């Protein structure tokens, strides 16, 4: 049947649907190479598949919202990993060994009073 | 169908009104859809605390407006008159739409 995974990264969240196939990937009704023009983003998306050796045994249906290129690419990689574990449960050990199961919780630090940014202070002068 | 939109500064006070709006409605015939938790608004304010200078010394405040949506589909006749006379608690804004 269909297998599902929810992935999140920065302000992005990806819905992933995994089913046996031949290796075709759709992201927001576009192809992988059409959606992600950045070469790093394409490698991030694939990374779980090159690891478990199920690259061309599956079909990927994926919708994403929010964030940017690297966030969505990373968000898909997380939800993909959560889909494969709903597929086979013996993959958790090798996926976690690759750092793919962890939800990356790094977010933008808020701007604070008296600072120019989250941490950049205004220029100081003794006199 | 009539639309029920509920506003309040306290989400505990807003759940009391919703719990008694969807209770004085299923009894009196009509059935209900919801309640729906619409997105809370967060209005923010930043003020200088010192009466004079000290620009970096500030207090940051916030008012949260909670929102609720209740759908009374197929309103019976005993249902309608059983709504304006409920008299909800203070600090709960109620808007009736048709």
């Amino acid at each position: 049947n269909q297998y599902y995974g929810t992935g999140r990264r920065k302000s992005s969240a990806a819905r992933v649907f995994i089913k046996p196939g031949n290796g075709k990937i759709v992201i927001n009704q576009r192809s992988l190479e059409q959606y992600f023009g950045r070469e790093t983003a394409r490698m991030v998306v694939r990374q779980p598949l090159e690891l478990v050796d199920m690259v061309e045994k599956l079909d990927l249906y994926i919708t994403v919202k929010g964030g940017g290129i690297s966030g969505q690419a990373g968000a898909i990689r997380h939800g993909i990993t959560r889909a494969l574990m709903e597929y086979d449960e013996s993959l958790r050990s090798e996926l976690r060994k690759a750092g793919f199961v962890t939800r990356d919780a790094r977010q933008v630090e808020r701007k604070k009073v008296g600072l120019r940014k989250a941490r950049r202070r205004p220029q100081f002068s003794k006199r | 169908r009539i639309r029920i939109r509920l506003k309040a500064f306290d989400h505990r006070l807003i759940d009391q009104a919703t719990a008694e709006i969807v209770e004085t409605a299923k009894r009196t015939g009509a059935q209900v859809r919801g309640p729906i938790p619409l997105p809370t608004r967060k209005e923010r304010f930043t003020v200088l605390i010192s009466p004079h200078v000290n620009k970096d010394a500030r207090d940051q405040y916030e008012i949260r407006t909670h929102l609720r949506l209740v759908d009374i589909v197929e309103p019976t006749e005993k249902t309608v008159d059983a709504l304006m006379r409920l008299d909800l608690a203070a600090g709960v804004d109620v808007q009736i739409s048709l």
Partner: protein
């Protein structure tokens, strides 16, 4: 240094608001200004009625004022005569139908606003500031407070150099958010200027 207001920091945690209505931007500023004029009148009229807290609500095109007090008979008067005299002034000010409710402050020795006002009236009568603060602290500790702190600042005893003095008994854990800390202030207008009083009263963690 400077400390956060003990009431404000707990307003959603263990302390309730003193005004509990809802309004959009269109009338939010006008409701605040009418609450101000109402409290300004009630506080001046009921100066000798031990008014601790004036809570204002606005159900629907009407205002409901709840006066917490320790001398309710003085607030009400004979057969509800006086409480009626205010129910008219409040409607005049608020511009909506008015309704007044009288709450009971039992043990005024455990209410920060009343304790602060007690000390302040004594200072305007030229009572020794030291005697007033000790009495207030001993009273509240005897009635079962878990702690109390009283602070007095200004030209104490008409001294030329102003200073601050404070006493404390029991626990007053101001950094614990879930601590029931009743806090209020008051001002005395002596012949040498203003003396400020602050009172913290701890009643147990919730």
């Amino acid at each position: 240094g400077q400390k956060v207001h003990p009431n404000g920091i707990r307003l959603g945690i263990v302390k309730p608001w003193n005004s509990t209505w809802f309004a959009n931007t269109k009338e939010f500023a006008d409701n605040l200004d009418s609450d101000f004029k109402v409290r300004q009148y009630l506080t001046k009229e009921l100066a000798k009625a031990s008014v601790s807290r004036i809570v204002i609500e606005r159900p629907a095109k009407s205002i409901r004022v709840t006066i917490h007090t320790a001398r309710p008979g003085i607030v009400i008067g004979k057969k509800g005569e006086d409480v009626e005299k205010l129910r008219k002034v409040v409607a005049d000010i608020a511009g909506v139908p008015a309704q007044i409710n009288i709450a009971e402050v039992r043990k005024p020795e455990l209410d920060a606003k009343l304790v602060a006002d007690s000390i302040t009236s004594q200072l305007e009568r030229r009572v020794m500031f030291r005697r007033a603060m000790k009495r207030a602290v001993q009273n509240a500790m005897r009635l079962g407070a878990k702690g109390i702190k009283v602070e007095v600042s200004g030209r104490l005893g008409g001294a030329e150099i102003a200073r601050t003095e404070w006493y404390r008994e029991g626990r007053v854990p101001l950094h614990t958010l879930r601590a029931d800390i009743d806090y209020n202030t008051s001002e005395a207008h002596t012949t040498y200027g203003v003396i400020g009083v602050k009172v913290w009263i701890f009643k147990g963690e919730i």
